[PDB]
């Protein structure tokens, strides 16, 4: 005669449609935790962003933060900071993510790694200072970490003879803006001459 | 002295940001395949859509298809069908997904299951007929399958005595519109009187 349908829950796919990017993005990570092997699989079918895309990212982030200050209050008071700590931290995390990507073990492309650090530093110059000294440790800590960053790259051009033309001028403008908390790299850079 | 950073690939999360909804949705499914156990986990933290949300879904689908016909051609010719087969099939799949959800094993809520079938049928009345008979097997096949659907529900009110008030009139308008290819349910429905 005839087959009569048997009810059942709806299919996983149909159920995920009612899940948004953050929702899938979020519930996808939990999967990696349960079955860590997923890391390899995902990394392979998903190509990394272009040096430009990454750079473009930070810009939006900091531009995002720059427009987030109070409607018209002292952008250096604590209050102004309270509203920005969030988009502030966003720009920093992204800084901590992308930088190791262009450093010595993982990236041997000297001329390609320095180029990036240049852009990253410029992003840090743009960070916002505050009246409270407690809110400026982030910008200081940045300058420190980056000085350590350029130092790692510069070292990848040590023994390999012939010392190509180095960004002697770049570090100058960088350190100038950074009020000298990048001297360790500048000397090392010049010392490579 | 000082720790010098060690480069590395960027973190999975940072890499997924450059992945869109379809991209995550798509690469998430592949995960379930490799580790089927994920099905249970996901189903639990993700609540199903409200009877209304599902209904709302189909509407958009068919409205989507209704606006997709050629710029001004015979919406019954083959050409017109070629452009719609896609959004056509979309409305059908969704029909095949959501219906089993409201049937006898999975759903015992008689008054809640029929209510849904009502809306689903109405969605099928709205389907587009064509000059070619080959393109109308989908609408026929629908009417058939749904007749089988109401039949399953109606059976869940069989032995359980007291035969509550049944949608005797609803099936009438339904079958009327469907040009009688739903008689098996209509009789059975009336036979339940």
From Swiss-Prot, chains A, B:
Annotated compartments: Nucleus envelope
Main location, first listed in the record: nucleus
Keywords carried by this UniProt record: Nucleus, Ubl conjugation
Post-translation changes: The N-terminal part (residues 1 to 72) is polyubiquitinated by rhp6, which is required for the interaction with the proteasome.
GO terms, biological process: nuclear protein quality control by the ubiquitin-proteasome system; proteasome localization
Family under the similarity heading: Belongs to the cut8/STS1 family.
Subunit relationships: Binds the proteasome.
Protein's UniProt name: Tethering factor for nuclear proteasome cut8
UniProt organism field: Schizosaccharomyces pombe (strain 972 / ATCC 24843) (Fission yeast)
Native organism taxonomy: Eukaryota, Fungi, Dikarya, Ascomycota, Taphrinomycotina
């Amino acid at each position: 005669a005839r087959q009569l349908p048997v009810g059942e829950q709806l299919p996983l796919s149909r159920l995920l449609q009612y899940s948004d990017k953050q929702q899938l993005f979020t519930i996808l990570l939990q999967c990696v935790e349960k079955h860590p092997d997923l890391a390899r699989d995902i990394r392979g079918i998903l190509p990394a962003p272009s040096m430009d895309t990454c750079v473009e990212t930070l810009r939006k982030l900091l531009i995002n933060l720059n427009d987030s200050f109070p409607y018209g209050g002292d952008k250096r008071g604590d209050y102004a900071f309270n509203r920005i700590r969030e988009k502030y931290m966003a720009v920093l995390h992204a800084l901590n993510d992308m930088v190791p990507c262009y450093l010595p073990p993982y990236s041997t492309c000297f001329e390609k790694n320095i180029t990036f650090l240049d852009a990253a530093t410029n992003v840090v110059h743009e960070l916002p200072e505050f009246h409270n000294p407690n809110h400026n440790v982030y910008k200081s800590q940045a300058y420190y970490e980056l000085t350590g960053a350029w130092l790692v790259v510069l070292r990848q051009l040590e023994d390999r003879p012939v010392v190509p033309l180095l960004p002697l001028e770049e570090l100058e403008e960088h350190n100038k803006t950074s009020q000298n908390r990048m001297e360790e790299a500048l000397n090392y850079l010049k010392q490579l001459q």
